Amino acid sequence: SNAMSKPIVLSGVQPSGELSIGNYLGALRQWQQMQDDYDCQYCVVDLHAITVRQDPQALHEATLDALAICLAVGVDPKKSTLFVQSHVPEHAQLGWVLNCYTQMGELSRMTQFKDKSARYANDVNAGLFGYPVLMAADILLYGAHQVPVGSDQKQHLELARDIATRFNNIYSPEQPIFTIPEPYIPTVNARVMSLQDATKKMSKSDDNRKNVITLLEDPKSIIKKINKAQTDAETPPRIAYDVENKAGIANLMGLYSAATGKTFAEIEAQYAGVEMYGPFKKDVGEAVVAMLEPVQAEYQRIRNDREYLNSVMRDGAEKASAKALQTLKKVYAAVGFVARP
Amino acid sequence: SNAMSKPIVLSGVQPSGELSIGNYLGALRQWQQMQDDYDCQYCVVDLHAITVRQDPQALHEATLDALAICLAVGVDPKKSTLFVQSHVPEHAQLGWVLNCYTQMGELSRMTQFKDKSARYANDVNAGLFGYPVLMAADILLYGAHQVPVGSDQKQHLELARDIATRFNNIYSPEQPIFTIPEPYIPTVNARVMSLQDATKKMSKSDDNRKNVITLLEDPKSIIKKINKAQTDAETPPRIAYDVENKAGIANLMGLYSAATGKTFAEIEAQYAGVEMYGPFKKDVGEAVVAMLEPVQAEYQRIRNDREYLNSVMRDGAEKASAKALQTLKKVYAAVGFVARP
Numbered sequence: 023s024n025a026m027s028k029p030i031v032l033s034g035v036q037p038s039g040e041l042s043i044g045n046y047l048g049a050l051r052q053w054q055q056m057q058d059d060y061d062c063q064y065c066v067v068d069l070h071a072i073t074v075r076q077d078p079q080a081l082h083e084a085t086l087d088a089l090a091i092c093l094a095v096g097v098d099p100k101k102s103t104l105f106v107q108s109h110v111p112e113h114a115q116l117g118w119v120l121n122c123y124t125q126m127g128e129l130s131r132m133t134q135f136k137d138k139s140a141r142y143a144n145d146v147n148a149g150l151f152g153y154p155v156l157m158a159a160d161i162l163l164y165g166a167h168q169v170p171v172g173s174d175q176k177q178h179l180e181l182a183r184d185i186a187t188r189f190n191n192i193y194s195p196e197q198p199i200f201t202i203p204e205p206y207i208p209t210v211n212a213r214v215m216s217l218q219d220a221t222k223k224m225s226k227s228d229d230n231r232k233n234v235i236t237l238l239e240d241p242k243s244i245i246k247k248i249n250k251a252q253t254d255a256e257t258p259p260r261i262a263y264d265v266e267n268k269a270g271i272a273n274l275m276g277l278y279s280a281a282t283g284k285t286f287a288e289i290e291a292q293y294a295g296v297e298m299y300g301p302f303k304k305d306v307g308e309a310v311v312a313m314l315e316p317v318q319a320e321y322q323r324i325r326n327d328r329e330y331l332n333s334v335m336r337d338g339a340e341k342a343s344a345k346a347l348q349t350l351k352k353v354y355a356a357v358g359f360v361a362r363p
Numbered sequence: 364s365n366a367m368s369k370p371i372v373l374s375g376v377q378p379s380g381e382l383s384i385g386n387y388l389g390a391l392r393q394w395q396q397m398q399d400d401y402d403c404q405y406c407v408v409d410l411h412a413i414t415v416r417q418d419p420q421a422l423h424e425a426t427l428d429a430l431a432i433c434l435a436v437g438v439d440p441k442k443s444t445l446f447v448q449s450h451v452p453e454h455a456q457l458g459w460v461l462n463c464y465t466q467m468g469e470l471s472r473m474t475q476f477k478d479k480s481a482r483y484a485n486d487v488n489a490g491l492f493g494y495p496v497l498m499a500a501d502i503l504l505y506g507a508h509q510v511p512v513g514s515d516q517k518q519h520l521e522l523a524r525d526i527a528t529r530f531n532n533i534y535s536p537e538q539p540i541f542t543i544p545e546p547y548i549p550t551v552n553a554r555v556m557s558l559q560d561a562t563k564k565m566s567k568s569d570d571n572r573k574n575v576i577t578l579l580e581d582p583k584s585i586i587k588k589i590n591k592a593q594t595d596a597e598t599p600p601r602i603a604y605d606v607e608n609k610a611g612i613a614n615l616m617g618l619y620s621a622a623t624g625k626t627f628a629e630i631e632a633q634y635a636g637v638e639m640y641g642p643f644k645k646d647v648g649e650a651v652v653a654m655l656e657p658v659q660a661e662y663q664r665i666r667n668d669r670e671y672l673n674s675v676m677r678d679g680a681e682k683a684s685a686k687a688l689q690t691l692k693k694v695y696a697a698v699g700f701v702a703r704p
Contacts (some may be wrong), residue, residue, distance in 0.1 A: 078699030101401040122490035149463035358419030363673040
């Protein structure tokens with residue numbers, strides 16, 4: 023009654039890299055609907071970005087890029103809580119407290135830290151080590167019931183659960199202070215594969231950019247990449263859906279289906295008797311451009327309306343802090359701090 | 364012109380344990396004067412207290428105890444910046460950022476962490492590991508030129524210097540953002556020794572309480588402890604100052620001198636020809652009670668005036684945040700964050 027009857031979801035949005043068409047089809051395309059079915063928070067995680075050395079100007083602009091992509095796919099500041107992490111002071115504050123309820127061993131065993139320790143040698147910074155604790159704060163501040171996490175963030179989510187449980191057991195065993203978060207289950211299981219290796223999931227961090235279409239990719243680059251996509255060895259060519267034997271075509275059919283709304287049964291019929299993949303790949307690229315272009319256009323407009331973006335940031339930070347401060351006050355009272363008068 | 368012409372000093376005040384008469388004579392007795400000669404901040408470090416498991420109610424009350432002891436020795440909220448750490452949100456915020464410029468190796472080699480790791484086994488928490496970074500934030504927020512540090516905090520102060528230098532070299536090599544802090548040099552080198560082992564400095568954390576007089580110790584306990592203090596083996600007894608050969612008497616003479624203003628030359632003359640230590644120890648205990656009692660009385664009054672304490676906390680947090688936020692904004696801009704609009 024009413025937001026109180028929907029689950030609370032918190033999503034972390036990175037201000038770095040470029041989102042892929044897999045991220046779009048697997049997640050962002052569904053955000054406008056999720057905003058109606060869940061009480062959603064979208065946090066642009068700039069405090070986590072600086073765990074690796076960032077060019078300052080690039081980070082600044084990437085933050086605005088992330089905010090604008092959220093708006094472009096239909097995140098509404100009035101219907102969701104959309105904000106930049108560093109704008110909401112409660113995040114770092116709860117993070118410090120939660121450090122005191124996190125075991126060193128729990129952080130040292132994190133696979134993401136162990137990788138970066140190996141890459142950076144003695145330079146490895148304490149932020150990279152500690153960011154799972156800050157992630158836990160990010161989630162727990164909002165009492166999120168559900169959190170979307172990639173494969174590489176699952177261990178981190180488990181630690182958040184462990185920290186919340188530990189704290190609740192100490193301070194509030196009968197009326198818990200923290201909600202124990204669970205993974206969010208996406209409503210579309212998109213299967214977007216690397217364009218030149220259809221056996222491998224499309225990855226936004228792939229060094230091989232021939233495998234990847236990004237959400238803000240130039241339409242001409244999208245067309246070229248799709249025209250060079252893996253098909254299959256079937257002779258004569260046959261456009262039919264089959265992941266095991268026709269993986270490349272299956273990936274193209276999945277893209278065409280997403281872009282046009284056509285079912286695999288309609289696509290098979292459309293190309294019945296066509297013994298060539300070239301025209302089909304042209305059709306797919308054009309369809310993918312037509313799907314993304316409207317998002318790109320909305321993005322490019324929103325992105326250069328700084329007065330609007332500032333309004334969004336201001337209103338989101340206020341809305342987020344109002345919620346987060348309630349949690350922070352309860353945590354501070356529980357551990358024994360004197361409340362600020 | 365005018366506060367801008369005095370050095371900035373930040374002192375950390377623990378909300379745990381009990382301050383000793385050595386802490387009083389070595390440090391706190393001089394705070395009223397320091398407040399005039401330096402631009403002083405006194406931070407009650409409750410965020411650092413929770414790096415070890417605290418009873419919540421005990422921590423709450425210990426915070427108020429610490430605040431009241433500062434006021435009782437003459438820290439004036441109008442002349443100094445006196446506040447509780449957790450009341451000023453900028454501390455945890457800068458702490459997170461500074462984690463990202465601190466090497467894991469720098470924290471792992473800290474002697475204080477290595478001790479606690481050995482004591483707590485797998486329980487050792489990430490707060491105990493990371494608190495040098497938060498200490499650095501506590502200092503750097505105020506642009507402190509000088510920081511009083513005990514032997515056990517010197518390594519931590521060096522890390523603050525290292526972090527400030529590293530950050531300045533990256534972001535501001537010509538116009539530094541951070542002031543590089545140095546140790547504060549106390550104006551009185553008090554030599555307050557353990558009462559039953561005059562060869563060892565009096566320690567507030569001594570398990571042997573017979574060695575320690577605390578600032579808020581009951582006068583009757585002070586009298587008993589001083590009457591059982593170490594003297595020396597000289598026969599006939601002779602009250603004369605000599606640290607190497609008459610350490611126990613030297614310690615008692617130092618206490619009597621502090622308490623009465625009498626020089627060692629006056630004390631020697633006062634007891635000329637007196638071949639007994641008993642009357643002298645009675646005189647010392649009475650003098651020490653008379654010195655501390657007025658502080659105790661002011662403390663006990665201030666401590667139970669919650670409206671006043673709340674005023675002090677409110678005004679101090681406002682004053683501290685106004686300074687700290689200026690530093691935080693500069694740091695956030697430098698690393699590349701979008702400023703909250």
